[PDB]
Design a binder for this molecule. Sequence first.
Ligand SMILES: O=C1NS(=O)(=O)c2cc(-n3cc(CCO[C@H]4O[C@@H](CO)[C@@H](O)[C@H](O)[C@@H]4O)nn3)ccc21
Ligand SMILES: [Zn+2]
Ligand SMILES: [Zn+2]
Length: 258
Amino acid sequence: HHWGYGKHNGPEHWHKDFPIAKGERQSPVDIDTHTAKYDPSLKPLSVSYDQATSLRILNNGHAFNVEFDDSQDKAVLKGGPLDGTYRLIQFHFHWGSLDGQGSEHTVDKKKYAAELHLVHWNTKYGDFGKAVQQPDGLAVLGIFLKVGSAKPGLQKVVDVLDSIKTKGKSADFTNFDPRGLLPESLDYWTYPGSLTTPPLLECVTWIVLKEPISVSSEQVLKFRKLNFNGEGEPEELMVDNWRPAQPLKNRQIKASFK
Ligand SMILES: O=C1NS(=O)(=O)c2cc(-n3cc(CCO[C@H]4O[C@@H](CO)[C@@H](O)[C@H](O)[C@@H]4O)nn3)ccc21
Ligand SMILES: [Zn+2]
Ligand SMILES: [Zn+2]
C-alpha cells in the first residue's frame, strides 16, 4: 500500500503522493513550553460527552478507531480556542514499539509512549467530508499517555482488541464512555495544524492537554499485538504508527494556563 509506517512507505515518503506534507501548517509539532504564550483570552474547554453514543471499533490498517454516532449533537467540544460546536466522530491512538516513543506531538522534545486523538468536526459544515476541506473544519483533542498505573476507563478498549487484530476487522462497541480517558486537568496548548496521516489536510485546530494520562505496561502491550496487515497476509505488528514532529513555520502555540 502507498503509505504507512514502514521503511519504504513511511512519513518521509508521504510528500510524493501528498505534497501538502511539506506545507505551512503540518502536524504534529514539538511544543516548546517556554516559547508557547499564555493567552488569557482563551476560554476553558467545554467537553460535553454525557450523551455520547459509541458504535463500533475498527482496525483500519493504520490504527484502531472507536466510532461514534455523529448524526446529532450528542458528544461535543466547544469553548477554548473554538468558535461554534464540534461533534465527536471517533477517537484513536498512536503508539510506539517501546515505552520511550509513540506520541506524535512532543513536549520540549519529550516523546510519550502513546497519544490519544479525539476527533471532532465543525457542525457548520454539515458532515466530516466537507469539514476536512475547511481551515476550521476539525478540532482534535490530543492526550498523552505515559506508562505507569493502569487507566481503568481504557480497559474495555484493550479487551476488545483481540477481536480486531487485523486490517479491516470491526466489532460492535456500544456504551463506551470517552470521559474515562480524560486527565484531571483540561489545561491545554493550541495551534493550527493538520491531519497527521494522508491526506494531511490543513483543517485542524489542535488542542493538546498538558496533563498525560497513565496506562499500564500491560495495556500498551496489548496495543502492540495488533497487526497492520489483513488476515491471511504476513504478520506485521502495529507499532510506531506515529508521524514525527514537523516544522512550526509561521505559527504560534498558545497556552491556556500560566
Ligand atoms: O490524520 C488524521 N488526524 S485526525 O485525528 O484529525 C483524523 C481523522 C480522520 N477521520 C476520518 C473519518 C471518516 C472518513 O474521512 C476520510 O474520508 C474523506 C472525508 O470523508 C477524506 O477527505 C479524508 O481522508 C477523511 O480522513 N473519521 N475520522 C482521518 C484521519 C485523521
Ligand atoms: Zn496504499
Ligand atoms: Zn491521530
